């Protein structure tokens, strides 16, 4: 099974490499991670928290991460060029807090001792794209407020704060709302707006949870109450809409079993998101995803990275 013949057969076209951020397209970097190596990384489900992680599996340019001491049903995949993982000792040097592996207390964890008691190695520093050596995102500092879209199913534009900054990105948090809604962005995200955007758009702004007298939430009053400043307008450099067109083919990670990447097709589009359909499967599986999501790639990504591509259901 090659893409050449599948295109010839379906009389289809692939989404050009130029439509992808090149972190989604780069295939020539070597994956240096090895089974057993230990490191630090955020919990996808709680992006504001850091844990000790172990490389559970290596496949192509990807790897499965395991929360030391916890159940294997929490393992998740990332690409080797993921900005959400860091080398051992990162949190300490960056002043971040670490959630100790199951069984330890924050006051009894030292990499030195830990590696020795587990007879393991820390993944070398030269594998991580993110280890705080980069220039912070311009104009976005911890404590600043803004309006951002929360994937609350359905989505809402809520009052939010920058609660963490790492290298070139920041973490958006929704005031007094559940932690799990946080997400890392950069200044060009299409989901963030400056304080006051909603009012100027004539849209409803969702105030903090249980904020007294929600109906009359007032940004100026709130910034006064918190002493927080608003992310300055100039800092927002929203990116242009993507140019993926319907029917273009590409490769996407199966979110029913992320260990697998299938042949995919653009089913529909919006300004910043595309709808994935896995060739040969029901449409019940279609799903929307941001155009810059790290789990979609140009055709041939698997082959070039040594990862198995699942052909359309035959």
mmCIF file with all atom_site columns, C-alpha atoms in Angstrom, residues 142-254:
data_model
loop_
_atom_site.group_PDB
_atom_site.id
_atom_site.type_symbol
_atom_site.label_atom_id
_atom_site.label_alt_id
_atom_site.label_comp_id
_atom_site.label_asym_id
_atom_site.label_entity_id
_atom_site.label_seq_id
_atom_site.pdbx_PDB_ins_code
_atom_site.Cartn_x
_atom_site.Cartn_y
_atom_site.Cartn_z
_atom_site.occupancy
_atom_site.B_iso_or_equiv
_atom_site.pdbx_formal_charge
_atom_site.auth_seq_id
_atom_site.auth_comp_id
_atom_site.auth_asym_id
_atom_site.auth_atom_id
_atom_site.pdbx_PDB_model_num
ATOM 1   C CA . UNK A 1 142 ? 1.326   35.072 34.233 1.00 0.00 ? 142 UNK A CA 1
ATOM 2   C CA . UNK A 1 143 ? -1.501  36.913 35.984 1.00 0.00 ? 143 UNK A CA 1
ATOM 3   C CA . UNK A 1 144 ? -2.800  38.721 32.898 1.00 0.00 ? 144 UNK A CA 1
ATOM 4   C CA . UNK A 1 145 ? -6.496  38.492 31.958 1.00 0.00 ? 145 UNK A CA 1
ATOM 5   C CA . UNK A 1 146 ? -8.224  37.967 28.614 1.00 0.00 ? 146 UNK A CA 1
ATOM 6   C CA . UNK A 1 147 ? -11.272 36.472 26.933 1.00 0.00 ? 147 UNK A CA 1
ATOM 7   C CA . UNK A 1 148 ? -10.898 33.019 25.445 1.00 0.00 ? 148 UNK A CA 1
ATOM 8   C CA . UNK A 1 149 ? -12.997 30.173 24.081 1.00 0.00 ? 149 UNK A CA 1
ATOM 9   C CA . UNK A 1 150 ? -13.387 27.287 26.540 1.00 0.00 ? 150 UNK A CA 1
ATOM 10  C CA . UNK A 1 151 ? -14.096 23.878 25.014 1.00 0.00 ? 151 UNK A CA 1
ATOM 11  C CA . UNK A 1 152 ? -16.995 23.409 27.409 1.00 0.00 ? 152 UNK A CA 1
ATOM 12  C CA . UNK A 1 153 ? -19.151 21.413 24.952 1.00 0.00 ? 153 UNK A CA 1
ATOM 13  C CA . UNK A 1 154 ? -20.730 23.575 23.874 1.00 0.00 ? 154 UNK A CA 1
ATOM 14  C CA . UNK A 1 155 ? -18.013 26.243 23.681 1.00 0.00 ? 155 UNK A CA 1
ATOM 15  C CA . UNK A 1 156 ? -18.260 29.540 25.541 1.00 0.00 ? 156 UNK A CA 1
ATOM 16  C CA . UNK A 1 157 ? -16.137 32.685 25.464 1.00 0.00 ? 157 UNK A CA 1
ATOM 17  C CA . UNK A 1 158 ? -15.107 33.173 29.084 1.00 0.00 ? 158 UNK A CA 1
ATOM 18  C CA . UNK A 1 159 ? -13.161 35.438 31.382 1.00 0.00 ? 159 UNK A CA 1
ATOM 19  C CA . UNK A 1 160 ? -9.656  33.971 31.552 1.00 0.00 ? 160 UNK A CA 1
ATOM 20  C CA . UNK A 1 161 ? -6.141  34.304 32.892 1.00 0.00 ? 161 UNK A CA 1
ATOM 21  C CA . UNK A 1 162 ? -2.646  33.375 31.817 1.00 0.00 ? 162 UNK A CA 1
ATOM 22  C CA . UNK A 1 163 ? -1.561  30.945 34.537 1.00 0.00 ? 163 UNK A CA 1
ATOM 23  C CA . UNK A 1 164 ? 1.765   29.636 33.215 1.00 0.00 ? 164 UNK A CA 1
ATOM 24  C CA . UNK A 1 165 ? 4.368   30.568 30.609 1.00 0.00 ? 165 UNK A CA 1
ATOM 25  C CA . UNK A 1 166 ? 6.861   28.078 29.191 1.00 0.00 ? 166 UNK A CA 1
ATOM 26  C CA . UNK A 1 167 ? 9.259   28.989 26.426 1.00 0.00 ? 167 UNK A CA 1
ATOM 27  C CA . UNK A 1 168 ? 7.184   30.417 23.603 1.00 0.00 ? 168 UNK A CA 1
ATOM 28  C CA . UNK A 1 169 ? 3.752   29.498 24.928 1.00 0.00 ? 169 UNK A CA 1
ATOM 29  C CA . UNK A 1 170 ? 1.322   30.344 27.701 1.00 0.00 ? 170 UNK A CA 1
ATOM 30  C CA . UNK A 1 171 ? -1.432  28.475 29.510 1.00 0.00 ? 171 UNK A CA 1
ATOM 31  C CA . UNK A 1 172 ? -4.987  29.822 29.313 1.00 0.00 ? 172 UNK A CA 1
ATOM 32  C CA . UNK A 1 173 ? -7.125  29.198 32.387 1.00 0.00 ? 173 UNK A CA 1
ATOM 33  C CA . UNK A 1 174 ? -10.783 29.989 32.956 1.00 0.00 ? 174 UNK A CA 1
ATOM 34  C CA . UNK A 1 175 ? -11.336 31.867 36.228 1.00 0.00 ? 175 UNK A CA 1
ATOM 35  C CA . UNK A 1 176 ? -12.849 29.682 38.944 1.00 0.00 ? 176 UNK A CA 1
ATOM 36  C CA . UNK A 1 177 ? -13.736 27.070 36.327 1.00 0.00 ? 177 UNK A CA 1
ATOM 37  C CA . UNK A 1 178 ? -12.539 23.481 36.202 1.00 0.00 ? 178 UNK A CA 1
ATOM 38  C CA . UNK A 1 179 ? -8.842  22.946 35.709 1.00 0.00 ? 179 UNK A CA 1
ATOM 39  C CA . UNK A 1 180 ? -9.325  20.474 32.843 1.00 0.00 ? 180 UNK A CA 1
ATOM 40  C CA . UNK A 1 181 ? -10.434 23.282 30.504 1.00 0.00 ? 181 UNK A CA 1
ATOM 41  C CA . UNK A 1 182 ? -6.964  24.854 30.450 1.00 0.00 ? 182 UNK A CA 1
ATOM 42  C CA . UNK A 1 183 ? -4.917  24.720 27.250 1.00 0.00 ? 183 UNK A CA 1
ATOM 43  C CA . UNK A 1 184 ? -1.545  25.933 26.007 1.00 0.00 ? 184 UNK A CA 1
ATOM 44  C CA . UNK A 1 185 ? -1.458  28.616 23.259 1.00 0.00 ? 185 UNK A CA 1
ATOM 45  C CA . UNK A 1 186 ? 0.855   31.001 21.532 1.00 0.00 ? 186 UNK A CA 1
ATOM 46  C CA . UNK A 1 187 ? -0.043  34.608 20.569 1.00 0.00 ? 187 UNK A CA 1
ATOM 47  C CA . UNK A 1 188 ? -1.564  33.560 17.243 1.00 0.00 ? 188 UNK A CA 1
ATOM 48  C CA . UNK A 1 189 ? -4.255  31.327 18.669 1.00 0.00 ? 189 UNK A CA 1
ATOM 49  C CA . UNK A 1 190 ? -7.742  31.911 17.154 1.00 0.00 ? 190 UNK A CA 1
ATOM 50  C CA . UNK A 1 191 ? -9.331  31.149 20.528 1.00 0.00 ? 191 UNK A CA 1
ATOM 51  C CA . UNK A 1 192 ? -8.012  34.136 22.467 1.00 0.00 ? 192 UNK A CA 1
ATOM 52  C CA . UNK A 1 193 ? -9.143  37.743 22.506 1.00 0.00 ? 193 UNK A CA 1
ATOM 53  C CA . UNK A 1 194 ? -8.300  40.898 24.452 1.00 0.00 ? 194 UNK A CA 1
ATOM 54  C CA . UNK A 1 195 ? -10.426 42.039 27.382 1.00 0.00 ? 195 UNK A CA 1
ATOM 55  C CA . UNK A 1 196 ? -13.534 43.638 25.912 1.00 0.00 ? 196 UNK A CA 1
ATOM 56  C CA . UNK A 1 197 ? -13.718 41.650 22.683 1.00 0.00 ? 197 UNK A CA 1
ATOM 57  C CA . UNK A 1 198 ? -17.160 40.160 23.413 1.00 0.00 ? 198 UNK A CA 1
ATOM 58  C CA . UNK A 1 199 ? -18.727 43.527 24.116 1.00 0.00 ? 199 UNK A CA 1
ATOM 59  C CA . UNK A 1 200 ? -17.324 44.918 20.863 1.00 0.00 ? 200 UNK A CA 1
ATOM 60  C CA . UNK A 1 201 ? -18.562 41.824 19.031 1.00 0.00 ? 201 UNK A CA 1
ATOM 61  C CA . UNK A 1 202 ? -21.909 42.155 20.751 1.00 0.00 ? 202 UNK A CA 1
ATOM 62  C CA . UNK A 1 203 ? -21.460 38.686 22.203 1.00 0.00 ? 203 UNK A CA 1
ATOM 63  C CA . UNK A 1 204 ? -22.206 37.102 25.577 1.00 0.00 ? 204 UNK A CA 1
ATOM 64  C CA . UNK A 1 205 ? -19.161 36.863 27.827 1.00 0.00 ? 205 UNK A CA 1
ATOM 65  C CA . UNK A 1 206 ? -19.232 34.061 30.383 1.00 0.00 ? 206 UNK A CA 1
ATOM 66  C CA . UNK A 1 207 ? -18.123 35.430 33.790 1.00 0.00 ? 207 UNK A CA 1
ATOM 67  C CA . UNK A 1 208 ? -16.166 33.468 36.415 1.00 0.00 ? 208 UNK A CA 1
ATOM 68  C CA . UNK A 1 209 ? -18.126 30.638 38.039 1.00 0.00 ? 209 UNK A CA 1
ATOM 69  C CA . UNK A 1 210 ? -20.430 31.852 40.845 1.00 0.00 ? 210 UNK A CA 1
ATOM 70  C CA . UNK A 1 211 ? -19.164 35.397 40.308 1.00 0.00 ? 211 UNK A CA 1
ATOM 71  C CA . UNK A 1 212 ? -21.547 37.557 42.414 1.00 0.00 ? 212 UNK A CA 1
ATOM 72  C CA . UNK A 1 213 ? -24.371 38.954 40.272 1.00 0.00 ? 213 UNK A CA 1
ATOM 73  C CA . UNK A 1 214 ? -23.128 37.433 36.984 1.00 0.00 ? 214 UNK A CA 1
ATOM 74  C CA . UNK A 1 215 ? -25.564 39.522 34.941 1.00 0.00 ? 215 UNK A CA 1
ATOM 75  C CA . UNK A 1 216 ? -23.613 42.659 35.816 1.00 0.00 ? 216 UNK A CA 1
ATOM 76  C CA . UNK A 1 217 ? -20.045 41.450 35.459 1.00 0.00 ? 217 UNK A CA 1
ATOM 77  C CA . UNK A 1 218 ? -17.816 44.435 34.622 1.00 0.00 ? 218 UNK A CA 1
ATOM 78  C CA . UNK A 1 219 ? -14.238 43.891 33.371 1.00 0.00 ? 219 UNK A CA 1
ATOM 79  C CA . UNK A 1 220 ? -12.924 47.136 34.857 1.00 0.00 ? 220 UNK A CA 1
ATOM 80  C CA . UNK A 1 221 ? -14.465 46.353 38.232 1.00 0.00 ? 221 UNK A CA 1
ATOM 81  C CA . UNK A 1 222 ? -13.021 42.834 38.111 1.00 0.00 ? 222 UNK A CA 1
ATOM 82  C CA . UNK A 1 223 ? -9.484  43.946 37.201 1.00 0.00 ? 223 UNK A CA 1
ATOM 83  C CA . UNK A 1 224 ? -9.760  46.381 40.090 1.00 0.00 ? 224 UNK A CA 1
ATOM 84  C CA . UNK A 1 225 ? -10.854 43.637 42.483 1.00 0.00 ? 225 UNK A CA 1
ATOM 85  C CA . UNK A 1 226 ? -8.002  41.395 41.393 1.00 0.00 ? 226 UNK A CA 1
ATOM 86  C CA . UNK A 1 227 ? -5.324  43.992 40.701 1.00 0.00 ? 227 UNK A CA 1
ATOM 87  C CA . UNK A 1 228 ? -4.676  42.087 37.471 1.00 0.00 ? 228 UNK A CA 1
ATOM 88  C CA . UNK A 1 229 ? -3.845  43.748 34.173 1.00 0.00 ? 229 UNK A CA 1
ATOM 89  C CA . UNK A 1 230 ? -5.294  42.812 30.787 1.00 0.00 ? 230 UNK A CA 1
ATOM 90  C CA . UNK A 1 231 ? -3.101  41.208 28.137 1.00 0.00 ? 231 UNK A CA 1
ATOM 91  C CA . UNK A 1 232 ? -2.364  44.248 25.937 1.00 0.00 ? 232 UNK A CA 1
ATOM 92  C CA . UNK A 1 233 ? -4.199  44.366 22.608 1.00 0.00 ? 233 UNK A CA 1
ATOM 93  C CA . UNK A 1 234 ? -1.061  44.520 20.452 1.00 0.00 ? 234 UNK A CA 1
ATOM 94  C CA . UNK A 1 235 ? 0.010   41.116 21.744 1.00 0.00 ? 235 UNK A CA 1
ATOM 95  C CA . UNK A 1 236 ? -2.759  39.318 19.866 1.00 0.00 ? 236 UNK A CA 1
ATOM 96  C CA . UNK A 1 237 ? -1.555  38.350 16.388 1.00 0.00 ? 237 UNK A CA 1
ATOM 97  C CA . UNK A 1 238 ? -4.219  35.873 15.321 1.00 0.00 ? 238 UNK A CA 1
ATOM 98  C CA . UNK A 1 239 ? -3.223  33.601 12.457 1.00 0.00 ? 239 UNK A CA 1
ATOM 99  C CA . UNK A 1 240 ? -5.059  33.461 9.138  1.00 0.00 ? 240 UNK A CA 1
ATOM 100 C CA . UNK A 1 241 ? -7.562  30.689 8.339  1.00 0.00 ? 241 UNK A CA 1
ATOM 101 C CA . UNK A 1 242 ? -6.053  27.392 7.171  1.00 0.00 ? 242 UNK A CA 1
ATOM 102 C CA . UNK A 1 243 ? -6.326  26.388 3.529  1.00 0.00 ? 243 UNK A CA 1
ATOM 103 C CA . UNK A 1 244 ? -7.287  22.744 3.797  1.00 0.00 ? 244 UNK A CA 1
ATOM 104 C CA . UNK A 1 245 ? -10.030 21.986 1.274  1.00 0.00 ? 245 UNK A CA 1
ATOM 105 C CA . UNK A 1 246 ? -12.625 19.224 1.388  1.00 0.00 ? 246 UNK A CA 1
ATOM 106 C CA . UNK A 1 247 ? -11.555 15.815 0.071  1.00 0.00 ? 247 UNK A CA 1
ATOM 107 C CA . UNK A 1 248 ? -7.830  16.457 0.484  1.00 0.00 ? 248 UNK A CA 1
ATOM 108 C CA . UNK A 1 249 ? -6.157  13.400 1.983  1.00 0.00 ? 249 UNK A CA 1
ATOM 109 C CA . UNK A 1 250 ? -3.684  13.204 4.884  1.00 0.00 ? 250 UNK A CA 1
ATOM 110 C CA . UNK A 1 251 ? -2.791  11.110 7.926  1.00 0.00 ? 251 UNK A CA 1
ATOM 111 C CA . UNK A 1 252 ? -4.362  11.501 11.348 1.00 0.00 ? 252 UNK A CA 1
ATOM 112 C CA . UNK A 1 253 ? -4.040  9.791  14.719 1.00 0.00 ? 253 UNK A CA 1
ATOM 113 C CA . UNK A 1 254 ? -6.999  7.553  15.539 1.00 0.00 ? 254 UNK A CA 1
#
